[PDB]
C-alpha cells in the first residue's frame, strides 16, 4: 500500500510529459489524452482497418525549404475504395497522424530509427536508408523477477 | 504477423477523468494479550 501511494506521485508528475502513453497503460486500452488544466480528457483510438495501404515516404524534408524539416516520417494512406489519399505522418507506437504538423529545425548529422509496424525504419539525413526487424534490435528490460 | 496501426482523433472534453486519491492503508491488529 505504501509503495502504491508513492508511485502515484510519479504517475501524477509524469502525465504532463506524455498523457497518451500513461493513459493507455492505466486504461489497458489505446487512447489519446490531453491535460485540460487539472483533469485529463481521454478519447479512444480506433485501429486502422483493412482496404488501407500505408505508404512510407522517402524524404523527411519540407518542399523547397532548407532550414525546416519534419521530425517523423511522412506517410500516404492510399485508399482502395476510391476514397482518395490521406497524407499524414508516422506517430509513436504505430499511431498514424492525419496531418504533418510535427516540424523541427533541420538538424545536421541526422540519424533516427522509427517504428513502422514490426520494423525499425532508419532515416539518415532526412532520407530513407534501411530497415531492421523489431526482433533483431537488442533489448533492455525494466522488469524485476519474482519466481 | 500483420502490423496494426492506429488512428487517434483529437479528444474532446466530453470524457474527463482524474487520478484517484491515495488509498488509506489498513492497520493490521495482529497481536494478543
Amino acid at each position, epitope marked *: 500500500c505504501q509503495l502504491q501511494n508513492r508511485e502515484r506521485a510519479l504517475w501524477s508528475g509524469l502525465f504532463p510529459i506524455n498523457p497518451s502513453a500513461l493513459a493507455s497503460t492505466i486504461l489497458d486500452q489505446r487512447v489519446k489524452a490531453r491535460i485540460l488544466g487539472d483533469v485529463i480528457s481521454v478519447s479512444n483510438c480506433p485501429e486502422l482497418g*483493412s*482496404d488501407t*495501404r500505408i*505508404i*512510407l*515516404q*522517402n*524524404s523527411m524534408r519540407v518542399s523547397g525549404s532548407t532550414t525546416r524539416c519534419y521530425s517523423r516520417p511522412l506517410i*500516404s494512406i*492510399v485508399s*482502395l475504395n*476510391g476514397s*482518395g*489519399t490521406v497524407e499524414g505522418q508516422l506517430g509513436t507506437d504505430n499511431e498514424l497522424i492525419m496531418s504533418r504538423d510535427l516540424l523541427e529545425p533541420c538538424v545536421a548529422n541526422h540519424k533516427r530509427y522509427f517504428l*513502422f*509496424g514490426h*520494423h525499425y*525504419v532508419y532515416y539518415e539525413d532526412y532520407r*530513407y536508408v534501411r*530497415e531492421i*526487424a523489431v526482433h533483431d534490435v537488442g533489448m533492455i528490460s525494466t522488469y524485476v523477477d519474482l519466481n | *504477423t*500483420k502490423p496494426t496501426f492506429y488512428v487517434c482523433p483529437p479528444p474532446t472534453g466530453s470524457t474527463i477523468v482524474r487520478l484517484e486519491p491515495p488509498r488509506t492503508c489498513p492497520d493490521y491488529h495482529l497481536g494478543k494479550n
Partner: antibody
Framework: QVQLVQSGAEVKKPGSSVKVSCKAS????????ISWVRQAPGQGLEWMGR????????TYAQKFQGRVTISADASTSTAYMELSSLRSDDTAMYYC?????????????????????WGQGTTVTVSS | DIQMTQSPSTLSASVGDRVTITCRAS??????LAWYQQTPRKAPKLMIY???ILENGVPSRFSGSGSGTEFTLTISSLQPEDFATYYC?????????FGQGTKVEI
C-alpha cells in the same frame, strides 16, 4: 473495381515493335506502379520492369534493359510497353500488373503489397 | 534472391489434403516473398505477400511461413478450387525474379 486491359490478340513480324497498351479504370493512376511480366507457353514467369508514379524513370529488368521501354500518361490512365526488337524470343503472354504505391515513396520492400490487380494477356506471336 | 528454386512439378492431391508447396531462395530473403495462383485460362492473382499475410478476398485456409531462404505454402482443407499453378515472387532487390512451378494438383 479497378480493371486493366491490354491491346489483345497481336501478331507481329520480327523486326518491328509491339506497343502494348494498358488502360486502367480507377484508382486515380497516381497510386499505380505499373509492372510488366510475361511467360512463354511452357515457361514459368518473368519480370520486365516497373514504372512508378510521376512516370519518368521506368526501371527495367536485367535481360530487357536494352530492349524494352515502358511509359505511362497519368492523364489517360494507360501504360505502354514497346520493345522494338522482336528477336523471335518475344513470344509470350505479356501481362500488365500493378502495385499500390504513391509518388515520392521510399525504395523499401515494406511498401510492396504485391501485384494485387492484373490485366488480361496479350498472346503475342513473333514468326512469319 | 536473384534466383529461386521450387517444389516438384505436380504434387498430385485430392480434395481435403494438406499440401505444402515449399520453395527456397538464394541470399536470405527476409520475409519478402509473395505467392500467386494462375489457373490455365486466367491471370495470376495475389495469395500471400510478406510470406505470411493473406490478401483481401482469399480464404483463410491458405497459410504461409518461413523467414530466410525457406518458405512454405501449406494449404489445409483443400476445397476444389486449388488445382492451379503457383509462383514464388522475390522483392528484396530488383529484378523481381519469379520462382515456383507447381503446374497443377490432380
Amino acid at each position: 473495381q479497378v480493371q486493366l486491359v491490354q491491346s489483345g490478340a497481336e501478331v507481329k513480324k520480327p523486326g518491328s515493335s509491339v506497343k502494348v497498351s494498358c488502360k486502367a479504370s480507377g484508382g486515380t493512376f497516381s497510386n499505380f506502379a505499373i509492372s510488366w511480366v510475361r511467360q512463354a507457353p511452357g515457361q514459368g514467369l518473368e519480370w520486365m520492369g516497373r514504372i512508378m508514379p510521376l512516370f519518368v524513370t521506368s526501371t527495367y529488368a536485367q535481360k530487357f534493359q536494352g530492349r524494352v521501354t515502358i511509359s505511362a500518361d497519368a492523364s489517360t490512365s494507360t501504360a505502354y510497353m514497346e520493345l522494338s526488337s522482336l528477336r523471335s524470343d518475344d513470344t509470350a503472354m505479356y501481362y500488365c500488373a500493378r502495385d499500390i504505391t504513391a509518388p515520392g515513396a521510399a525504395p523499401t520492400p515494406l511498401n510492396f503489397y504485391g501485384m494485387d490487380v492484373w490485366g488480361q494477356g496479350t498472346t503475342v506471336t513473333v514468326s512469319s | 534472391d536473384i534466383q529461386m528454386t521450387q517444389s516438384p512439378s505436380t504434387l498430385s492431391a485430392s480434395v481435403g489434403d494438406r499440401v505444402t508447396i515449399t520453395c527456397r531462395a538464394s541470399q536470405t530473403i527476409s520475409t519478402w516473398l509473395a505467392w500467386y495462383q494462375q489457373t490455365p485460362r486466367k491471370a495470376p492473382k495475389l495469395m500471400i505477400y510478406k510470406a505470411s499475410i493473406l490478401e483481401n478476398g482469399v480464404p483463410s485456409r491458405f497459410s504461409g511461413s518461413g523467414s530466410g531462404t525457406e518458405f512454405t505454402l501449406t494449404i489445409s482443407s483443400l476445397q476444389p478450387e486449388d488445382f492451379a499453378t503457383y509462383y514464388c515472387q522475390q522483392y528484396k532487390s530488383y529484378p523481381w525474379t519469379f520462382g515456383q512451378g507447381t503446374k497443377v494438383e490432380i
